[PDB]
Amino acid sequence: VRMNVLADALKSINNAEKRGKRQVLIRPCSKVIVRFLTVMMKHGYIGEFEIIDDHRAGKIVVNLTGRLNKCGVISPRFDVQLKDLEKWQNNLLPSRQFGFIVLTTSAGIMDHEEARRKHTGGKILGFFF
Amino acid sequence: GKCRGLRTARKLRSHRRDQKWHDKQYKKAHLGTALKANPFGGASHAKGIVLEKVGVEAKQPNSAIRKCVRV
Amino acid sequence: EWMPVTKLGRLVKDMKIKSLEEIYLFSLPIKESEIIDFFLGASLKDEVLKIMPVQKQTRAGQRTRFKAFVAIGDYNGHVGLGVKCSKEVATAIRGAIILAKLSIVPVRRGYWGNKIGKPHTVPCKVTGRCGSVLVRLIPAPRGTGIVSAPVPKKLLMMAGIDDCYTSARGCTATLGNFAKATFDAISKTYSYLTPDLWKETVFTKSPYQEFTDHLVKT
Amino acid sequence: TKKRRNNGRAKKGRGHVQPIRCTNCARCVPKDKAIKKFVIRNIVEAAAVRDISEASVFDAYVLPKLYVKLHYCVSCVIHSKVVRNRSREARKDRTPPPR
Amino acid sequence: GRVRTKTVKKAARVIIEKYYTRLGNDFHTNKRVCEEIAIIPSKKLRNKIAGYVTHLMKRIQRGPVRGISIKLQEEERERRDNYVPEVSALDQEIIEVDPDTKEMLKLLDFGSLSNLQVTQPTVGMNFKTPRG
Amino acid sequence: PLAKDLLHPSPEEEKRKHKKKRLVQSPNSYFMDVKCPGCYKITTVFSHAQTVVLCVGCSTVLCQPTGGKARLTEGCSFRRKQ
Amino acid sequence: MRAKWRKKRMRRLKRKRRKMRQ
Amino acid sequence: SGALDVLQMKEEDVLKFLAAGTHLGGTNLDFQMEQYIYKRKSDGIYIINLKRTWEKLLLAARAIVAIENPADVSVISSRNTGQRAVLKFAAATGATPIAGRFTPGTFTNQIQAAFREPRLLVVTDPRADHQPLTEASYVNLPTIALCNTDSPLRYVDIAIPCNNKGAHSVGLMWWMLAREVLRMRGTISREHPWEVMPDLYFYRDPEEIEKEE
Amino acid sequence: MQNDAGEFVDLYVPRKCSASNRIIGAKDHASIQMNVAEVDKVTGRFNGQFKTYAICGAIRRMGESDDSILRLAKADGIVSKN
RNA sequence: AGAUACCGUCGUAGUUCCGACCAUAAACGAUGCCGACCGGCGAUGCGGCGGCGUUAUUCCCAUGACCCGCCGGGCAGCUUCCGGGAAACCAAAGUCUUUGGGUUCCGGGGGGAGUAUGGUUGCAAAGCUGAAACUUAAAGGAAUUGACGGAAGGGCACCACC
RNA sequence: UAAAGUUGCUGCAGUUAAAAAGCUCGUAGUUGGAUCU
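YS: structure for the whole thing
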């Protein structure tokens, strides 16, 4: 069956971006998907998206600015400490100049740079560059 | 595919332990039959008494009498 | 002397196209090696990577041809790789030098960490593939040098890359596939979209459009 | 290597197909693998048509037809020259010859 | 066998292409002009070229020639090809059109045209070929 | 097609789609009031009814069960709601 | 030799060993 | 058109399109041509939206006009049905025609005699003229094609939806493209009909004329 | 493409596809740069200006160059509506 | 030549049914299962929905057989520079160095060897589990060009025939 | 020990190179849809 709806969302975005499409339909939606999309959008990787409100579970239409090289999930959500963040971001990111690791944190869902700014660790949700 | 779960450490460790025995080098090193069958008994060198001198014919592409000794 | 046979060759010969990067901007095929001689001929250095005897079984014996692999490039961000098969070795080397000149691609160089000075390494992790051979280039710190096998090291030094980490998978004993995978990885440096390249592309007039009058009046 | 995408038969979506016997050698060949021919002919050959027609006690009697169903195993098909080896690309052509 | 070789055929092609004006329908004049205008070291080869030249000229007399093209006659080819019918075949006072294209034109702001005449649609949708 | 507007599909396209694959799922069924020539009240019948619906004031049958939509009897006027 | 016949010969050897071993 | 009153389609153009059978597509529809059709008839023929046809024709004319050398535009036709139309378009507009066989390597092989380096390519049928389309992908050559309902759109950058089967329709569309190109350049005006009637572009099929004569 | 001081250090700045915003590589010989002539609003004649659309070879290979160029022209006002 | 074979005439067990064992097959799509996403096209089977018209339809609607579409689940096919792969090929064998959806089984150069031994199941045949000593530089996959074929199809030759 | 991404958690393979149990059920194990400022 379907576990990790965030994995499905990120893989659908990845495949739509590879196909060159300007919009992708993501279903089901969830809070974690919305926060991940907001993290991706604050860095200009996707652009505005819309939540279609069914009465069962969300749908999302994400507009796709052709900037996303790759958005992926890390399963399982390994717990990550601050001292171990550099190793994760050296394994997952193409450069030290761009690309973000998303972590769920007691302070919210946010990228690794802002996690460093808040001096906090968490669980790795995924990455995008 | 392989299991990717936060609580699969036992399965991963046991699978690696079992599948290491399918490696020739590992099984030879860790099984003990090779050390029992090794004439030196794990030593780098060994002393012996020359029983006789023998000549071994080189394998088919080559032709020579390699001078060995039975010790 | 050089008499061009194409519009691009004529435009280059007549000092109408300023740099090789104006040709690269429009992804125009380069079919005359004299253009590359015109632009980078004063700095191009070629190395023969391998002479490889290939054989075709015939009714009476084995026909033998020689395949020359030649890497060319100035050590300042251009590199090419050419393979030529010929009856004689010298002809193969000459043809492979020509083909390497014709395949010269621009190389993008970046920074590992802080951006003091000129770029020294690959802008990001890139991967080239050729027949089971996978070559991955990873940005390396300043002064690292090229941590690579000799063939990718030759190609990367000829590309002006100072520091690099390299990972190779597959049958790298196939020198041709190794060289082509390294060339492909180096080529992918300028095709990789980075956030510094997000600014909207402002189009300029093509060489075939800017100097149409010169071509017609000639 | 795998020569044919259909494995040389027509067995898709089922496990077993009842065999039949080659009409030439009696080899057991699966029914959807056997090469089937429907021979439509006359009990009286073309040369003999006139003699039987003029020996008939009827007028416009029309000769009866013979209906033969032949099943050939692949070896017998190839020997009898009803199918032939074809190039790697001509093998894909399932169009019957125009006849 | 009397098949012409690519040497004879190619030389005759070049002779027709380059020296059309002098070349005529007679074989002997073709032989003389081919001797005069080209260095043909063999009398037999001269004669083979002249024979193919004559046959090619008869071929142009038939009309178009597939294997050669001369611009000196291509200009007059285009001169003849400028044929303009007195009444355009596209100017028909009555144009039969189907109801669906009638609806399309009505949605195209051309429903007030006067040359259009609606046609009876086919009563069945049997347009496919019987499969098998 | 690339730039296919996934937020506002055509109503024809949404009617073409499977009821569950629509942007917001909606049933293909409806409730319809059947009025009989010899009745004083209107009976609500599901378009895809599975039961044999008798007349609300008689023994006349209204609809028959079927693999899909219920088959209405001939002689009773059905009008769709909403 | 053919793998099927090699297996058959191996089984014959196994039968002989089984019967002989008392 | 650009929502411009001067560039909008006029009635006489519509009558020409209807007489030529331009709006008559085919029985098959390409999935990339669905945006150019109107509806399928009861006989299984797709009707081609003539407004979109005019829009694509004007877009192709705008593409052709933005080529400073007229000879840099190459007009191809392999089928004899569009050969005369291509020749007349080349004569009127200054384009370079390739009527008949297209030799492979005409764009990619610089040793050949017929080697040429067009800046724009206009072909009649993408299916029949597939070789120039495939070679235009080696030399950065944008392509304009007169595409039917079933025409593939690979390597086709501006497709003009039209009947490219009947001689009347293809001749008319080459005539329209020439007229629009000349009008856009400045030669010939838009306030008077073109002196050339479209019949100068039609494939004749000499048998019909000879039996008529 | 910038360093710490601020000077631009790239050899050149490659074009991007007008339909996908992906970089058109220097060896993408299937990619095109269509020039679309602009027209005076009153006369309908080529006014010397043009709109430029760069399409990568990947889009042209999948058959999407047609619709991509049509969308680009429609956004620029060159192509009308309906 | 020998045939203990191929071929022929017979012909036991068996092949058939019942009960009880056996649990193995190139038991094959040589492709685990569940889920998501990623092209086009025409078919076909089942169910449903809509629609000109034809036909069986006897004052009619139904419904049945067709015809034209649509939807869902199937068995498949064609096409594609989706992408992948050593390639053959695969719309999955794709979404893999831009490497993490979940999970089970399972391989680690070729032999020795599925052998020995121990255990266990079986009336037996055998099944499951299953080594090592020793030996060896290759074995193997895909494709290419030759050579060959007691493979097929064409062509030439009064040193072939007619 | 690295080289060995030839033990692969990172990070390997299983169509044909070695390899997916004949096929289902099924306990433990592992993994489990949206949703609550």
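YS: worth flagging: The two ends of chain I are 42 Å apart (CA to CA).
IM: good catch. Also Residues 1 and 43 of chain I are 45 Å apart (CA to CA).
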